[PDB]
Amino acid sequence: GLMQFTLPVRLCKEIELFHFDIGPFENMWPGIFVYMVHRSCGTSCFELEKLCRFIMSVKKNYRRVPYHNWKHAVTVAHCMYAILQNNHTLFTDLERKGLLIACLCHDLDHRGFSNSYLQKFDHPLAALYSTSTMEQHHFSQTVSILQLEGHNIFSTLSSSEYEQVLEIIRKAIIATDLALYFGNRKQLEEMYQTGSLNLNNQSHRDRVIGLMMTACDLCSVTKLWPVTKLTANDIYAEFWAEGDEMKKLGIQPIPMMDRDKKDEVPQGQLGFYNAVAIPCYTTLTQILPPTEPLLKACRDNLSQWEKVIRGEE
Numbered sequence: 668g669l670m671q672f673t674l675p676v677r678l679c680k681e682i683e684l685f686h687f688d689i690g691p692f693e694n695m696w697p698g699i700f701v702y703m704v705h706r707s708c709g710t711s712c713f714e715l716e717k718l719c720r721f722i723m724s725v726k727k728n729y730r731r732v733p734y735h736n737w738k739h740a741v742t743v744a745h746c747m748y749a750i751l752q753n754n755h756t757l758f759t760d761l762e763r764k765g766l767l768i769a770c771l772c773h774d775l776d777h778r779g780f781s782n783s784y785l786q787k788f789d790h791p792l793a794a795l796y797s798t799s800t801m802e803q804h805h806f807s808q809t810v811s812i813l814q815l816e817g818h819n820i821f822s823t824l825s826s827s828e829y830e831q832v833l834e835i836i837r838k839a840i841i842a843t844d845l846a847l848y849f850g851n852r853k854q855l856e857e858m859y860q861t862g863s864l865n866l867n868n869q870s871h872r873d874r875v876i877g878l879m880m881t882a883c884d885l886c887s888v889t890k891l892w893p894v895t896k897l898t899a900n901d902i903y904a905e906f907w908a909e910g911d912e913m914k915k916l917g918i919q920p921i922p923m924m925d926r927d928k929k930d931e932v933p934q935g936q937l938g939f940y941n942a943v944a945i946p947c948y949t950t951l952t953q954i955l956p957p958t959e960p961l962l963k964a965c966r967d968n969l970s971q972w973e974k975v976i977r978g979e980e
């Protein structure tokens with residue numbers, strides 16, 4: 668009851684910044700997450716024994732793939748922590764509870780392949796869930812773990828608070844399908860510029876939480892350049908394995924996925940910063956001004972990718 672999780676001084680300070688890197692010591696990641704739930708949510712949000720049990724079952728259900736792994740889950744939860752701490756009074760008690768859990772769970776049991784590859788392989792999951800295939804699977808894995816004996820971290824919420832939090836989590840996880848992001852951001856753009864955006868409108872809140880999920884999920888592009896560049900290697904290690912598997916099915920992969928098109932990586936990063944990341948953090952910053960450091964970090968990494976193309980590294 669009287670037990671604070673605490674971190675060493677450098678972590679205690681740096682964890683509050685958007686660009687924080689959770690580091691290479693795997694055994695400290697659960698303690699980093701609990702630290703963030705206690706400061707974001709309070710030391711009473713969850714029964715500590717249940718939370719610990721939930722975190723370790725979540726970890727066990729992430730696979731040892733190069734990018735979509737336990738380290739990504741915790742990185743995406745830290746970015747959400749940073750957003751929640753810098754916009755304290757905009758979010759309900761249930762959103763603060765739900766969203767950090769959503770982020771920890773958002774890629775549960777990912778195999779390292781896109782929804783596209785599951786559909787071309789004819790994976791069973793592609794018949795169960797015709798769109799947002801992996802994302803419906805991640806939410807399903809989340810509900811499975813919540814129903815393990817001793818794992819229901821939400822057990823002491825009213826019947827209707829429980830339903831609301833699982834609905835926050837479902838939408839937050841579905842919104843990490845980047846196919847859904849483009850139209851969601853366009854609507855958020857229009858609603859903010861015509862001045863119709865209304866955080867009391869539940870469907871507006873939904874849209875804004877969806878963008879927050881895209882922003883946290885992409886947060887590798889908002890780090891110190893060395894973190895950004897090394898993370899890009901893990902990302903392409905998956906994409907090129909997917910390309911290899913497309914070729915085994917007798918299909919030319921898109922260029923993104925073709926390891927023969929390594930030379931073009933810098934230009935593909937430019938595409939990605941301009942089509943996805945920059946517009947994401949731009950709209951996020953207009954809606955939630957204290958998230959500007961994500962936009963600023965993204966723009967700095969774009970200009971690092973421009974330097975790579977100009978031979979200056």
Ligand SMILES: Cn1ncc(C(=O)N2CCC2)c1C(=O)Nc1cc2nc(N3CCOCC3)nn2cn1
Binds near residue numbers: 887923934
């Ligand atoms: C940095 N980051 N964080 C997230 C993602 C991302 O997409 N998701 C989906 C799972 C995570 C990317 C990311 O690299 N995206 C990305 C890279 C890329 N390279 C190319 N190529 C290169 C070869 O030459 C042709 C163009 N197209 N292209 C399009 N998008």
Ligand SMILES: [Mg+2]
Binds near residue numbers: 773774801843844
């Ligand atoms: Mg995902």
Ligand SMILES: [Zn+2]
Binds near residue numbers: 739743773774843884
């Ligand atoms: Zn993800």
